Amino acid sequence: MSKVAIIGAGPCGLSILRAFEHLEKKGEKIPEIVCFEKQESWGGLWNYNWRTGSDQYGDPVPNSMYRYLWSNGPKECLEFADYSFDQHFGKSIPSFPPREVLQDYILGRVSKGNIKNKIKFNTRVINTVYRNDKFEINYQDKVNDKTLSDTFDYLVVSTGHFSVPFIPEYEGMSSFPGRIMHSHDFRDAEEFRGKNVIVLGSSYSAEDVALQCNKYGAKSVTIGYRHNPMGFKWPKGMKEVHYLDKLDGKKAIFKDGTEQDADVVILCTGYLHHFPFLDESLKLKTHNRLYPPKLYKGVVWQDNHKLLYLGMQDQFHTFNMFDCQAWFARDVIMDKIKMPSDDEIDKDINKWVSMEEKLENPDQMIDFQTEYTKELHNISDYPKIDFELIRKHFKEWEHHKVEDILTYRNKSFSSPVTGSVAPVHHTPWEKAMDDSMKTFLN
Amino acid sequence: MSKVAIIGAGPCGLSILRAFEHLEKKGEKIPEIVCFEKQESWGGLWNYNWRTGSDQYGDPVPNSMYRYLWSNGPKECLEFADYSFDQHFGKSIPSFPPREVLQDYILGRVSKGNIKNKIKFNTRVINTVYRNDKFEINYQDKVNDKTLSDTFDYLVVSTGHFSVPFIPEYEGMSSFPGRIMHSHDFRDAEEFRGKNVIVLGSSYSAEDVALQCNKYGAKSVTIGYRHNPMGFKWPKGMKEVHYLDKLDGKKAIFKDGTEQDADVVILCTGYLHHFPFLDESLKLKTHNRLYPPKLYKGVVWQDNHKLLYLGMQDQFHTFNMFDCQAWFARDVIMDKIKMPSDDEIDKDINKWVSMEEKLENPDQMIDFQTEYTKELHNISDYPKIDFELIRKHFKEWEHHKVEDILTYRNKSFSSPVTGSVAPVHHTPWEKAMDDSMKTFLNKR
Numbered sequence: 001m002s003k004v005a006i007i008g009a010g011p012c013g014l015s016i017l018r019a020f021e022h023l024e025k026k027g028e029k030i031p032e033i034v035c036f037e038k039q040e041s042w043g044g045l046w047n048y049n050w051r052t053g054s055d056q057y058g059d060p061v062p063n064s065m066y067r068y069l070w071s072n073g074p075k076e077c078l079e080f081a082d083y084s085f086d087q088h089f090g091k092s093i094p095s096f097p098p099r100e101v102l103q104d105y106i107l108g109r110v111s112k113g114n115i116k117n118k119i120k121f122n123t124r125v126i127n128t129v130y131r132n133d134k135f136e137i138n139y140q141d142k143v144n145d146k147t148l149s150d151t152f153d154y155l156v157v158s159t160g161h162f163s164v165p166f167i168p169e170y171e172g173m174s175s176f177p178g179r180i181m182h183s184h185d186f187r188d189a190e191e192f193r194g195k196n197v198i199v200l201g202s203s204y205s206a207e208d209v210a211l212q213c214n215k216y217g218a219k220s221v222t223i224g225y226r227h228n229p230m231g232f233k234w235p236k237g238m239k240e241v242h243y244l245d246k247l248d249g250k251k252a253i254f255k256d257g258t259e260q261d262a263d264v265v266i267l268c269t270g271y272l273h274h275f276p277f278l279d280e281s282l283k284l285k286t287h288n289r290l291y292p293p294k295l296y297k298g299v300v301w302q303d304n305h306k307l308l309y310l311g312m313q314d315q316f317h318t319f320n321m322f323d324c325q326a327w328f329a330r331d332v333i334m335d336k337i338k339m340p341s342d343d344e345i346d347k348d349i350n351k352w353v354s355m356e357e358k359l360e361n362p363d364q365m366i367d368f369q370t371e372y373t374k375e376l377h378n379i380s381d382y383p384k385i386d387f388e389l390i391r392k393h394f395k396e397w398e399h400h401k402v403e404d405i406l407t408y409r410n411k412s413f414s415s416p417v418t419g420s421v422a423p424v425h426h427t428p429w430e431k432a433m434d435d436s437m438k439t440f441l442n
Numbered sequence: 443m444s445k446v447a448i449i450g451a452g453p454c455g456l457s458i459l460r461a462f463e464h465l466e467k468k469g470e471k472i473p474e475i476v477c478f479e480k481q482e483s484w485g486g487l488w489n490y491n492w493r494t495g496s497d498q499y500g501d502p503v504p505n506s507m508y509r510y511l512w513s514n515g516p517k518e519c520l521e522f523a524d525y526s527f528d529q530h531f532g533k534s535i536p537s538f539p540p541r542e543v544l545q546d547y548i549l550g551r552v553s554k555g556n557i558k559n560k561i562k563f564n565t566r567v568i569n570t571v572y573r574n575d576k577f578e579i580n581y582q583d584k585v586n587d588k589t590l591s592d593t594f595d596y597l598v599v600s601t602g603h604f605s606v607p608f609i610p611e612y613e614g615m616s617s618f619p620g621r622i623m624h625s626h627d628f629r630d631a632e633e634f635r636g637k638n639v640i641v642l643g644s645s646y647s648a649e650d651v652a653l654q655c656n657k658y659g660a661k662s663v664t665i666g667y668r669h670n671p672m673g674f675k676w677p678k679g680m681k682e683v684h685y686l687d688k689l690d691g692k693k694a695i696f697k698d699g700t701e702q703d704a705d706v707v708i709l710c711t712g713y714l715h716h717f718p719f720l721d722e723s724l725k726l727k728t729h730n731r732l733y734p735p736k737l738y739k740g741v742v743w744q745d746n747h748k749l750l751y752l753g754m755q756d757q758f759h760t761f762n763m764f765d766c767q768a769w770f771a772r773d774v775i776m777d778k779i780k781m782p783s784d785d786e787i788d789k790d791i792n793k794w795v796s797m798e799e800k801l802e803n804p805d806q807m808i809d810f811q812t813e814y815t816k817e818l819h820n821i822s823d824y825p826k827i828d829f830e831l832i833r834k835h836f837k838e839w840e841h842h843k844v845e846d847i848l849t850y851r852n853k854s855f856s857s858p859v860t861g862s863v864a865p866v867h868h869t870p871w872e873k874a875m876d877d878s879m880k881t882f883l884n885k886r
C-alpha cells in the first residue's frame with residue numbers, strides 16, 4: 001500500500017525496478033513506484049552522451065563514458081542471475097564487450113514489461129526532507145522548467161557516484177596553453193591524435209584513458225601518480241612518473257625531475273559522492289571505498305531505515321552486486337526483512353567497516369566484496385549464481401592485467417550462471433577499432 | 443536596522459556594496475549586509491578560471507571568460523562615475539584594455555575599505571523562501587560541506603546571466619569524433635592551433651571566439667548562423683554560412699550546402715537566466731533581453747518589493763548601469779525611494795516593455811538603454827557622468843565594427859567622467875598576442 005520513490009534509472013535503479021517486477025509477475029501486490037531520471041532515457045552511465053558539463057536546462061551532465069569504450073572487467077563477473085547472457089544474446093560472445101553491447105543487455109532485461117512506464121525522464125530530484133513519517137520530494141520537470149512535489153513512504157537513492165568529478169588544482173594551470181579536463185569530460189580520443197597527453201591518477205580512469213589515447217594515436221602519453229605507480233606493462237610511447245609539480249607553458253614538470261611537453265592534461269582524479277537533493281540528516285558523506293559506514297548491509301541508512309542507498313560502494317562487482325542490494329532493499333520495503341535492534345545494526349556495520357579498513361591488496365578486496373555480496377544473496381531470493389567462480393575470475397583478471405595490460409581484454413571467462421565459455425573476440429583489443437554491436441556479435 | 447543579503451560579488455554585487463559604502467563613509471548608519479560568493483574571490487565574470495564544468499566541490503563553474511580576452515566595448519562607456527579611470531590608473535590609457543586591466547579597476551574601487559569583510563567566499567546560496575516577512579536562506583559552506591541558514595529582510599540577486607550555458611543539440615553530434623563545447627568552456631585558444639573550427643551563433647561570443655581562434659592559429663574558422671549573418675569583414679581563413687544541418691562524422695554540413703571538415707564545434711549559443719536557489723514564487727524567468735517584465739525599474743520584483751535583481755537585462759551599458767541600478771536598490775532598501783501603487787508599477791513596467799519589444803536595430807537599442815539608465819540616474823545620487831556622450835560612443839563603436847571588425851579595439855574614446863582622451867595603444871589588437879596587464883601598461 002506504500003509509495004516508493006527511486007532516484008536514478010541506471011543499473012541500480014533498474015535492478016530494484018526489476019526486483020519488484022519479479023514479485024508483480026508472480027501475482028503479488030507491490031507498492032506504487034515512481035522513478036525519477038534526469039537523463040532523457042534509462043541506462044545511467046551506460047548511455048553515451050556527447051554533452052559535457054551541463055545540459056540545455058542547466059543540469060549537470062551525469063554521463064562519463066566515452067566513444068570506443070570497452071568494458072574493463074570480465075562480463076562474466078557482472079552477469080544477471082535472472083537474465084543470462086545466453087538468454088539475451090542467444091549465443092556465446094567474448095568477455096569484454098563494447099559499451100553498447102552491455103547497454104543492450106542491461107536495458108533488455110527490463111524492457112519487456114511495464115517498468116519503463118514507471119520512470120519520469122528529464123526529471124531531476126532537487127529537494128528531500130523527512131517529515132511526519134514521509135519523504136517530501138521536490139523535483140524539476142526540466143522540459144517545462146517547473147518544480148513539482150510528491151510524498152513517499154520509502155526513498156531509494158540510486159544516483160551512482162562516478163558523475164560529479166573531483167578536480168584538483170595544480171600550479172601553472174592558470175596559464176597552460178592547452179586543454180585541461182577531467183576524465184568525466186572525455187568523449188572521443190581522436191581529439192588527441194598527435195598530441196602530447198598528460199594523465200593524472202592511478203586507478204581505472206587513468207589506466208583506460210591513457211590506453212585509449214595511445215590506441216587513437218596520441219603522440220605521447222605520460223601518467224603522473226601521487227603515491228605509487230600502477231606499474232603495468234605500458235606500450236612504447238607511454239610512461240609513468242611521480243607527482244606533477246607544475247605546468248610551465250607547454251611543459252609538465254614532475255617531482256621526480258621529469259619534464260614533458262604537454263598539450264593536454266586529463267585529470268583522472270575520481271568523483272564525489274554528491275547529494276545536493278538530500279537534507280543533511282539524510283545525506284551519505286563518504287569518499288570512494290568498499291564499505292562506507294552508516295549503511296546497514298551497505299544499503300539501509302543507519303538513521304532512517306526507510307532510506308535505502310544502492311551502489312554507493314567502490315566496485316569490483318557491479319551488476320549482480322547491485323541486484324543483491326536491490327533484492328534486499330525490496331524485501332526491506334515489503335517488510336519481509338526485519339531491521340534488527342539499533343545496537344545490532346551498529347555492531348554489524350562496525351564488523352564490516354573494520355574488515356574493510358584492513359584490506360591491503362586487490363585479492364583481499366575481491367574476497368571482501370565477494371563475502372559482502374554473498375551474504376546479501378543469502379537473505380533474499382535473487383536466483384542462483386556462482387560467486388565463488390566470480391571470485392576466481394576477478395583474481396585471474398587482475399593477473400592478466402599485470403601480465404599484459406594491452407591484452408587482458410582478449411581473454412575468455414565462463415558464465416557463473418550458465419557455465420557457457422566465452423569465445424575469444426575475432427580482433428585483439430589493441431587493433432579493435434570496430435566496436436559495433438554487429439561485429440561483436442559476429 | 444534591517445539585514446540585507448546579496449548573492450554574488452561580481453560587478454553588480456560590488457556596485458551595491460559600494461553604494462552602501464558611500465553612505466557609511468558620510469556617517470549614515472546602514473543595514474547589516476551579508477554577501478555570498480561561490481568563487482574563492484570577488485570579481486565575478488572578470489576572474490579568469492582555468493576550471494570548466496564544475497569545481498572540486500561539485501559546484502558548477504560560473505566563469506566564462508577566456509585567455510586573451512580584451513574589452514569588447516569602449517572602456518569609456520563603462521566608467522564608474524564615482525571612481526574614474528584617471529583616478530585609478532593615474533594616467534590616460536587606451537580604450538580597449540585586456541581583462542586583467544578592467545578586473546584591476548573593478549576591484550580597485552572596492553578594496554580600500556571594509557567591503558571585502560562583508561563577503562563570504564566559497565559559499566553558495568542553495569535555497570530561498572519568503573516566510574513571515576523574511577527571506578529564509580540556506581547556503582553551502584563549500585570548504586566544510588555544510589549547510590547553514592540565516593534570515594534577511596531584503597534580498598539582492600546579483601548572480602548575472604552569462605554563466606549557465608544554453609547548449610542546443612544538432613544532428614550527428616552523438617557520432618562526432620572531435621570536441622563539442624560551449625563558449626562557456628572556452629579557455630585557451632592555443633588549444634585549437636592548426637584545427638578546423640566551427641562556431642555557431644551570431645552575437646558577441648560567436649564574433650570574439652571566432653576571431654580568437656583565427657588569431658591563435660586555427661587552420662580555419664567557419665561561423666554558422668541560423669537567421670542572419672553578423673556580416674563583419676572577416677579575415678582570411680574565416681567564413682560565415684547558413685545553419686548547421688548535421689555533423690556527418692568529421693564533416694559539418696550546412697543548409698546552404700557548405701561542407702567543412704571539423705575538428706571542434708564551439709556553440710556560442712548564449713546562456714540561461716538560472717536561479718535554482720530561489721523559490722518559484724521569487725524566480726525571474728526570462729530569455730536574454732533589454733527589459734524583462736516583472737521588474738519595476740528593471741530591479742524590483744513586482745510580486746515582492748524586498749527582492750531586488752541587478753544586471754539581469756541584456757547589455758550595451760554595463761558597469762555604470764549596474765551602478766545606477768544599485769544606487770536605486772540601495773535607496774529602496776533605505777526607504778528613500780517609495781514604491782508607487784501596484785497599478786502605477788504595472789503601468790510603468792508595461793511602458794518600458796512595450797518600448798523594448800519595438801526596438802529594431804542597435805541604434806534604437808542603445809537609445810533605449812541610455813534612457814533606461816538616465817532615468818535610474820535621476821532618482822538617486824550616483825555622481826555626474828555624461829550618458830549623452832556614452833550614447834554617441836556606442837553608436838560610433840557599432841560603426842567601427844562594421845567598418846573593420848579587426849581594428850575597432852584600436853580606436854580612441856573620451857571619458858564621460860573626466861573628459862580625458864584615450865591614447866592609441868602601443869600594439870594593434872590584431873597583433874597583440876600577450877594579454878598581460880604588465881605588458882599593456884608598460885612601454886613596448
Ligand SMILES: Cc1cc2nc3c(=O)[nH]c(=O)nc-3n(C[C@H](O)[C@H](O)[C@H](O)COP(=O)(O)OP(=O)(O)OC[C@H]3O[C@@H](n4cnc5c(N)ncnc54)[C@H](O)[C@@H]3O)c2cc1C
Pocket residue numbers: 007008009010011012013036037038039043044045046062064065066070071072073078123124125126158159160161162163277310311315317318319
Ligand atoms: C567511465 C566509466 C566506465 C565504467 N566501465 C565499467 C565497466 O566496464 N564495467 C562495469 O561493471 N562497470 C563500469 N563502470 C561502473 C559503473 O558504476 C556501473 O557500471 C554502473 O553504471 C553504476 O550504476 P548506478 O545505477 O549505480 O549509477 P549510474 O549508472 O551513474 O546511474 C545513476 C543515474 O542516476 C541519475 N541521477 C543522478 N542524480 C539524479 C537526480 N538528482 N535526479 C534524477 N536522476 C538522477 C543519473 O542520470 C543516472 O542515470 C564504469 C564507470 C565509469 C564512470
Ligand SMILES: Cc1cc2nc3c(=O)[nH]c(=O)nc-3n(C[C@H](O)[C@H](O)[C@H](O)COP(=O)(O)OP(=O)(O)OC[C@H]3O[C@@H](n4cnc5c(N)ncnc54)[C@H](O)[C@@H]3O)c2cc1C
Pocket residue numbers: 449450451452453454455478479480481485486487488504506507508512513514515520565566567568600601602603604605719752753757759760761
Ligand atoms: C565572455 C564574456 C565577456 C564579456 N566581456 C565584457 C566586456 O568586455 N565588457 C563589458 O562591459 N562586459 C562584458 N561582459 C559582461 C558581463 O556580464 C558584465 O561585465 C558583468 O560581468 C556582469 O556582472 P554581474 O555581477 O551582473 O554578474 P557576474 O559577473 O557573472 O557575477 C555574478 C557572481 O555571482 C556568483 N554566484 C552565482 N550564483 C551564486 C550562488 N548561488 N551563490 C553565490 N554566488 C553566486 C558568481 O560566482 C559570480 O561571481 C562579458 C561577459 C562574458 C560572458
Ligand SMILES: NC(=O)c1ccc[n+]([C@@H]2O[C@H](COP(=O)([O-])OP(=O)(O)OC[C@H]3O[C@@H](n4cnc5c(N)ncnc54)[C@H](OP(=O)(O)O)[C@@H]3O)[C@@H](O)[C@H]2O)c1
Pocket residue numbers: 069070071072073162168183200201202203204205206208209225226227228268269270271288315
Ligand atoms: N570501462 C572502462 O574501460 C573504464 C574507464 C574509466 C573508468 N572506469 C570506471 O570508473 C570508475 C572510477 O574509477 P576512477 O579511476 O575514475 O576513480 P577512483 O577509483 O576513485 O580513483 C581516483 C584516482 O584519483 C587519484 N587522485 C586523487 N586525488 C588526486 C590528485 N589531487 N591528484 C592526482 N590524482 C589524484 C587517486 O590516486 P592517488 O590518491 O594515489 O593520487 C585515484 O587513483 C570505476 O568504477 C571504473 O570502473 C572504467
Ligand SMILES: NC(=O)c1ccc[n+]([C@@H]2O[C@H](COP(=O)([O-])OP(=O)(O)OC[C@H]3O[C@@H](n4cnc5c(N)ncnc54)[C@H](OP(=O)(O)O)[C@@H]3O)[C@@H](O)[C@H]2O)c1
Pocket residue numbers: 511512513514604610625642643644645646647648650651667668669670710711712713730757
Ligand atoms: N569581451 C569580449 O570580447 C566578449 C567575448 C565573448 C562574450 N562577451 C559577452 O558575453 C555576453 C553574451 O553574449 P553571447 O553571444 O554569448 O550571448 P547572446 O548575446 O545571448 O547571443 C546568443 C546567440 O545564440 C544564438 N543561438 C541561439 N540558439 C541557437 C541555436 N540553437 N543554434 C545556434 N545559435 C543559436 C543566437 O542567434 P540565433 O538565435 O539567431 O541563432 C545569438 O546569436 C555579452 O555581454 C558579450 O559582451 C564578451
